Amino acid sequence: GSSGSSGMSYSVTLTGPGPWGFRLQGGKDFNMPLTISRITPGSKAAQSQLSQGDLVVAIDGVNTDTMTHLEAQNKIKSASYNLSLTLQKS
Incomplete structure (x- = not known):
């Protein structure tokens, strides 16, 4: 079928430079x-x-x-001014 459950979608604002100490x-x-x-x-x-x-x-x-592990990671580098990341509550 088609239906996804959610708990709480949030985002994080990691201003740059960080660095981003997260994998x-x-x-x-x-x-x-x-x-x-x-x-x-x-x-x-x-x-x-x-x-x-x-x-x-x-x-x-x-x-x-849609973005692969790398892609996503590459995004981290791409970021500059700020590093936004939208997370979701499992």
């Missing part, structure tokens, strides 16, 4: 949801709403379900 997990090229692999303790990512396990939907306003 991505799974991905489209992995047939997995882009989740917050890991996060650096004391980093901005660990001072926002970014948490390990989070479900990334869009990066800087760009869905990930």
